[PDB]
Design a protein around this ligand. Structure first.
Ligand code: SF4
Lengths: 52, 96, 100, 318, 173, 156, 104, 70, 114, 105, 82, 98
């Protein structure tokens, strides 16, 4: 919501990239779920692997 | 540097103005002779053009004073060709 | 051509030109100074006649240079000006008027 | 013969704009460790032609919410004025010699703004309206400073005649006399053409495409051509005003070349600035132009009024 | 081309009708733009280069701030054009008809007296045959503002400063 | 005939301009958009081929679907595609945009952008390398080079 | 991004993928480092410092960049913790917390 | 490398050099091989008009020298 | 009349470019394509709704500043007078008043937005 | 209430632009300087009531100079009669009026 | 004391305004304290924009120069050496 | 008088009629005011140039200055009405009667 160019309200609408990773992981083994974390933060991949 | 150059330019402008002043009397003489000749030609052609019209005095002054009044553009080039009228009117303004 | 010889023309034809200007600026009527206007042209023609007889070629070089520039500047033809002044100072004895 | 002169001042300018697009792309690339267009033609020399043919063979779309008349008039005004602001430029001889060519340039720029305004307004889109309002704010910020700086630097010229600028700088560039005004004028020209650190009307990273977001194919090409033609023309104005060039009346080519090279250098610096700085916020643009330039422009206007009188160096009127 | 000034004046009247019919202020803006440019053309044709360029420049800058406001205050969900409302179109057509009638009456009938006496001859006639010399008489007269018109300068400057003050006082709530 | 030769030469001129000045829109959805940025990186330099990343869809010629096309995103992708003035092309980058990729059996993933927009070139990979995307774009230029649009018109 | 390209082939030379290496797996990594990889990483990291300094030359002291970033999006320390911020979003407000130091 | 930008700069240089040269050459062609005379002020325009009449051919560029007198 | 010729040529060239742009390419138009652009989603409100100016005072004062710039333009010719003292005093007076108006607007927080 | 403070204190605030016959920069005369001078010198000190009727010839000449209404009427009559004569072929414009003779310098 | 602190603070926080007031201040004071302002006035008077209309000689004008270039009258020799 | 004078006077009359005949917005009334000011400028300029009233060539500039001063006054009043009522409609100015 902009009053001129001043931001009165900022409402982030997300889910346009919601691919259901957490649900898809439940149907795959622990090894098969590892590549899913590479795609979570696709700018920092190997860090996501380390956390998993 | 700009001070020196501007002073020199002022001297050059003064010299050009002096040249214009020297040339001015001849131009004034030519201008007055040309204006008088054009007025005479207009009067002569008017004497023929409006001879039939009743009560039309030819060359009648429009002012009460018996003094020289510089003629307007329409009083000099009134019956000249359109090209000459356009020149003498808008030539300096339209020349770029 | 007039601008090239203007400085010498003003000095030599001063007397008849000034009389005509005084007439025009006192009569305030062009028809009362035609005779003085005629004497301006006669003296102007006589001024150029002397140039043609003593400084023909150097003067022709001078005004051709001036004619080239669109502003008809005097500072782009000082070399030709000196040639014209030198001949005129010798053959005719005229001296160009100073500044102002 | 005058029509031939008009064509020889318009068509070469359009070709220069077309190749300036390529020059900008290649300069940005080589300043970004890249290579500009290099496949289409030798060294990319055929890229502008491909771009033009693509744009003019591309389908133009007329927005459903757009006011057609203004939407079509805006691009025409932009290009026509961009091509007209070259008419009075002295290189070395101006096509049209005006006693007040400078004020003519100012008026022509002021009118060109309405192209962005109407294009934005008529586009009938939120981003286009934002772009138009940003253009309004931009012209509010620079116009006064632009005029004041131009007046101050022309106070040593003696008149608004553009041709006289060549004579005034016959011994020395006028930038050696007004380099603070030169810097401020350069920044004002950057802001005016909606250019580097002042690309707010278009705002690629903030407004998608700004006022021309709803323009496609031909009209978009016309706006781009008008923008780059204004860039080259303003850089030419900067060249003649401050970076004076020698003019031998018998060999005008000498001036023409020197002039062209200086204008090319200024355009290259425009691209250089485009690929070196982040974009301003137009609030900050207006604050800068109103609170750092304008006071200084007024002070330097006082100084350049007083200086010729106090030094007996008033330039000739004619 | 001997009636360029008359054509420009007719376009002046056309633009005045255009922004007098009251379309959307946006369209009134371009109406005033056309009128100002054509008036600059007329003044240029009469020898007023500086004056004509001055009206052109000022109104060009002034109508810009008006446009800014038209999009901020006078913004109608459906902005109206000269062919959008029968009232606006009626005013536009009436103005055009009035202008055309007066032009026809003035041209075909040489001497026309509506309120003043107008002569049908070209405007070139009234021009003077004098020589200004190495002068731009309009420019010199205008520049005489700082030498002759010191009082005018003082009053105008004071009015402009007081105008700034008045604007700030008005737009403060 | 002379008519076919002129049309064929005109068709080549039209095709050459379109294929050599392709303007993709800045439209990236997921992991594949990062590798798309590396095609514009100095090493590969898509701008070198005339491929310039315009922002507005109305000033673009190619839509490179780079990333997963979720159900929530599908109407947005179609409208942005529809606002592209013809001739427009779609290049599907990555297995996510090709047939759903890793998320093919997902409740909120469209099984390929082909179900939403017609696709001209399919670039395989997860993510395809910056050369693979560049190969697909250069393949698109060849596909445009084989477009006899005017030549068919002369024979309609 | 040219340096980002050089690091991408470090991913590719050790896993076979430029971005999604799937290299770090539960229990260690997938494959040992190929011979000569450590030397090439050293060569990259040797000259990468200048790249950062070139980046700072264009942004750190640029008055335009500072105008666009200084006093923009100010987050208080208390709000950052309550709103769940982490990483730079915490340490940018003065909060001294790094999960590599406190919980290595 | 960086000199690869030079061809485009040279093409633009030629395209910007054409206008100036063309204007100068056209001015010389239409003014008898001389610079086109400027008429910034009415005095210069009056000089131009007198020169046109003096020429007799209704062209100001052709100038009559001392040969015309007498 | 030469300036009129130049203006006519430029306008005709621009309009011819518009004509070629709108009549050379193959046109295929439908409702979705010509819809307003709002970054892929449908706009909420009309673009012809009021758009508040946070710098309105700046514009209203830019009016008077443009007036003062119009007043200052005749200065190059004004320096050619014999009354240089009076001319200089009046020019500096106008510039001082312009600076004073700017200062008053600045100190009273007029140049600030919102 | 015309409080004539200018005539009292001797100041000249606006009397320098009231007429075109006053001093002007570089002595650029007005187009009707002579007529206005005659009208002003005629009607100086005699009062407005007398000036309206007595110095009426001077004022009429001044107005004619300013607007040229009667001169334009005469020129229009001449033009109309010339056009009517040309339509009937009773007149032939002279060569110097037809652009056939070189105008004097 | 206070002036030095104010000026140092002024040029440390708002250096733009410090220069503008200094430049503006000089433009008002320097012209009065100059020997060339009178020369600037004389140059403007010297330039002959309009014709020097002659006056009728009554015989009692000793200094008025009835001549082309004889010594009487004003001289621009000062401008030549400027 | 020349026909250009007639056209300019007619333009002034049309602008005056427009200003006197409001429709909805206060912006259009200010437009008619500016149009009348422009017409007066053109009239005065033509009169001064035609009669070679050199010293009076500064009059149109002063007229323009006070014209845009009145325009700024109008713009400020316009913003206050919009701030107080939401629209610049001339019908909102209704509290003061008779
Ligand atoms: S194809 Fe692979 S890398 Fe590309 S967006 Fe889909 S999951 Fe990410």
């Amino acid at each position: 919501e902009l009053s001129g160019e001043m931001v009165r309200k900022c409402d982030p609408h997300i889910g346009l990239l919601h691919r259901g990773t957490e649900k898809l992981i439940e149907y795959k083994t622990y090894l098969q779920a590892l590549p899913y974390f590479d795609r979570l933060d696709y700018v920092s991949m190997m860090c996501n692997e380390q956390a998993y | 540097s700009m001070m020196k150059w501007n002073r020199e330019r002022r001297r050059l402008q003064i010299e050009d103005f002096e040249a214009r002043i020297a040339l001015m009397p001849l131009f004034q003489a030519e201008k007055d002779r040309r204006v008088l000749q054009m007025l005479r030609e207009n009067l002569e052609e008017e004497a023929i053009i409006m001879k039939d019209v009743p009560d039309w005095k030819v060359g009648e002054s429009v002012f009460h004073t018996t003094r020289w009044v510089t003629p307007m553009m329409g009083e000099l080039y009134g019956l000249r060709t359109n090209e000459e009228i356009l020149s003498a009117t808008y030539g300096f303004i339209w020349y770029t | 051509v007039l601008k090239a010889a203007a400085h010498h023309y003003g000095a030599q034809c001063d007397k008849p030109n000034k009389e005509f200007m005084l007439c025009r600026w006192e009569e305030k009527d062009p028809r009362r100074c035609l005779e003085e206007g005629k004497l301006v042209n006669q003296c102007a023609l006589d001024f150029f006649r002397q140039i043609k007889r003593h400084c023909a070629e150097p003067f022709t070089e001078y005004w051709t240079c001036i004619d080239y520039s669109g502003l008809q500047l005097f500072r782009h033809c000082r070399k030709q000006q000196a040639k014209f002044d030198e001949c005129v100072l010798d053959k005719l004895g005229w001296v160009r008027p100073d500044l102002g | 013969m005058f029509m031939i002169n008009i064509l020889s001042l318009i068509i070469p300018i359009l070709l220069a704009v077309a190749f300036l697009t390529l020059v900008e792309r290649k300069v940005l690339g080589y300043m970004q460790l890249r290579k500009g267009p290099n496949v289409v033609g030798p060294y990319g020399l055929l890229q502008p032609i491909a771009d033009a043919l693509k744009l003019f063979t591309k389908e133009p779309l007329r927005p459903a919410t757009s006011s057609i008349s203004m939407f079509i008039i805006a691009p025409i005004l932009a290009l026509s004025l961009a091509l007209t602001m070259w008419v009075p430029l002295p290189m070395p001889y101006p096509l049209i010699n005006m006693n007040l060519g400078v004020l003519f340039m100012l008026a022509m720029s002021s009118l060109a703004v309405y192209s962005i305004l109407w294009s934005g307004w008529a586009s009938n889109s939120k981003y286009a309206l934002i772009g138009a309002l940003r253009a309004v704010a931009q012209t509010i910020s620079y116009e006064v400073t632009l005029a004041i700086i131009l007046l101050s630097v022309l106070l040593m010229n003696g008149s608004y005649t553009l041709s006289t600028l060549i004579t005034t700088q016959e011994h020395i560039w006028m930038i050696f006399t007004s380099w603070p005004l030169a810097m401020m004028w350069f920044i004002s020209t950057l802001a005016e053409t909606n250019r580097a650190p002042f690309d707010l009307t278009e705002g690629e990273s903030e407004l998608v495409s700004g006022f021309n977001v709803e323009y496609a194919a031909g009209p978009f090409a016309m706006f781009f051509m008008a923008e780059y033609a204004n860039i080259i023309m303003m850089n030419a104005f900067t060249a003649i005003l401050f970076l004076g060039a020698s003019h031998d009346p018998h060999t005008p080519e000498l001036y023409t070349i020197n002039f062209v090279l200086k204008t090319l250098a200024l355009t290259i610096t425009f691209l250089w600035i485009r690929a070196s700085y982040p974009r301003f916020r137009y609030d900050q643009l207006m604050h800068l132009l109103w609170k750092s330039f304008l006071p200084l422009t007024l002070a330097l206007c006082m100084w350049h009024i007083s200086l010729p009188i106090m030094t007996a160096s008033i330039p000739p009127q004619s | 081309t001997m009636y360029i000034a008359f054509i420009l004046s007719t376009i002046f009247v056309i633009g005045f009708v255009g922004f007098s019919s009251k379309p959307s202020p946006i369209y009134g803006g371009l109406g005033l733009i056309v009128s100002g440019g054509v008036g600059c053309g007329i003044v240029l044709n009469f020898g007023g280069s500086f004056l004509g360029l001055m009206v052109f420049l000022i109104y060009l800058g002034g109508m810009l701030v008006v446009f800014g406001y038209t999009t901020a205050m006078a913004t109608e969900m459906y902005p109206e054009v000269w062919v959008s409302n029968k009232t606006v179109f009626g005013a536009f057509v009436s103005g055009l008809m009035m202008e055309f009638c007066m032009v026809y009456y003035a041209l075909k009938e040489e001497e026309v007296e509506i309120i003043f006496k107008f002569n049908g001859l070209g405007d070139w006639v009234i021009y003077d045959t004098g020589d200004s010399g190495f002068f731009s008489e309009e420019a010199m007269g205008i520049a005489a503002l700082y030498s002759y018109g010191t009082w005018l300068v003082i009053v105008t400057g004071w009015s402009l400063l007081i105008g700034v003050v008045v604007i700030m006082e008005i737009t403060r709530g | 005939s002379r008519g076919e030769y002129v049309v064929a030469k005109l068709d080549d001129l039209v095709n050459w301009a379109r294929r050599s000045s392709l303007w993709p829109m800045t439209f990236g959805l997921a992991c594949c958009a990062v590798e798309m940025m590396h095609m514009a990186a100095p090493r590969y330099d898509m701008d070198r081929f005339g491929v310039v990343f315009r922002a507005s869809p109305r000033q673009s010629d190619v839509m490179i679907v780079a990333g997963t096309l979720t159900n929530k995103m599908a109407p947005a992708l179609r409208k942005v595609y529809d606002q592209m003035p013809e001739p427009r092309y779609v290049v599907s980058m990555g297995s996510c945009a090709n047939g759903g990729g890793y998320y093919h059996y997902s409740y909120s993933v469209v099984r390929g952008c082909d179900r939403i927009v017609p696709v001209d070139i399919y670039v395989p990979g997860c993510p395809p390398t910056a050369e693979a995307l560049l190969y697909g774009i250069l393949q698109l230029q060849r596909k445009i080079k084989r477009e006899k649009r005017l030549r068919i018109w002369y024979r309609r | 991004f040219e340096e980002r390209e050089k690091m991408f082939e470090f991913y590719e030379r050790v896993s076979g993928a430029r971005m999604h290496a799937a290299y770090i797996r539960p229990g260690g990594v997938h494959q040992d480092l190929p011979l000569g990889l450590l030397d090439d990483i050293y060569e990259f990291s040797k000259n990468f410092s200048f790249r950062i300094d070139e980046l700072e030359e264009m942004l750190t002291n640029n008055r335009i960049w500072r105008n666009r970033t200084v006093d923009i999006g100010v987050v208080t320390a208390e709000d950052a913790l309550n709103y769940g911020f982490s990483g730079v979003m915490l340490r940018g407000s003065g909060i001294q917390w790094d999960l590599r130091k406190t919980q290595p | 490398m960086w000199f690869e930008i030079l061809p485009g700069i040279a093409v633009m240089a030629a395209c910007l050099f054409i206008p100036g040269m063309a204007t100068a050459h056209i001015h010389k062609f239409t003014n008898g091989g001389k610079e086109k005379r400027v008429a910034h002020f009415s005095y210069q325009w009056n000089l131009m008009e007198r020169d046109r009449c003096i020429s007799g051919v209704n062209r100001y560029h052709v100038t009559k020298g001392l040969e015309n007198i007498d | 009349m030469n300036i009129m010729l130049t203006l006519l040529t430029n306008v005709t060239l621009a309009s011819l470019l518009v004509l070629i742009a709108f009549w050379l390419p193959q046109l295929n138009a439908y409702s979705e394509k010509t819809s307003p652009y709002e970054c892929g989603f449908d706009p909420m409100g009309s673009a012809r709704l009021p758009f508040s100016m946070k710098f309105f005072l700046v514009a209203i004062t830019f009016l008077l500043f443009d007036l003062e710039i119009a007043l200052l333009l005749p200065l190059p010719w004004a320096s050619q007078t014999n009354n240089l003292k009076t001319m200089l005093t009046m020019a500096l007076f106008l510039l001082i008043l312009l600076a004073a108006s700017l200062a008053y607007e600045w100190t009273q927080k007029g140049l600030e937005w919102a | 209430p015309f409080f004539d403070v200018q005539k009292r204190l001797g100041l000249d605030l606006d009397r320098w632009m009231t007429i075109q016959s006053a001093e002007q920069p570089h002595k650029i005369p007005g187009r009707c300087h002579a007529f206005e001078k005659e009208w002003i010198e005629c009607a100086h000190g005699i009062g407005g009531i007398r000036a309206e009727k007595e110095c009426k010839i001077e004022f009429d000449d001044f107005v004619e100079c300013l607007l040229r209404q009667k001169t334009m009427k005469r020129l229009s009559a001449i033009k109309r009669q010339r056009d009517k004569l040309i339509k009937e072929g009773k007149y032939t414009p002279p060569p110097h009026h037809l652009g056939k003779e070189d105008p004097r310098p | 004391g206070r002036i030095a602190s104010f000026l140092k603070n002024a040029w440390a926080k708002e250096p733009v305004l410090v220069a503008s007031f200094a430049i503006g201040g000089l433009a008002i004071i320097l012209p009065s304290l100059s020997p060339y302002t009178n020369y600037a006035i004389r140059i403007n008077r010297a330039t002959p924009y309009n014709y020097p209309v002659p006056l009728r000689d009554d015989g009692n004008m000793p200094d008025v120069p009835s001549h082309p270039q004889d010594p009487q009258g004003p001289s621009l020799e000062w401008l030549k050496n400027l | 008088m020349p026909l250009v004078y007639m056209n300019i006077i007619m333009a002034f009359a049309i602008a005056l009629a427009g200003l006197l005949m409001y429709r909805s917005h206060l912006m259009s009334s200010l437009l008619c005011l500016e149009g009348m000011m422009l017409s007066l400028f053109i009239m005065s300029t033509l009169i001064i140039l035609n009669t070679h009233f050199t010293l009076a060539n500064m009059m149109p500039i002063i007229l323009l200055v006070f014209a845009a001063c009145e325009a700024a006054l109008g713009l400020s009043l316009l913003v206050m009405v919009s701030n107080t009522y939401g629209t610049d409609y001339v019908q909102n100015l209704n509290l003061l009667q008779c």
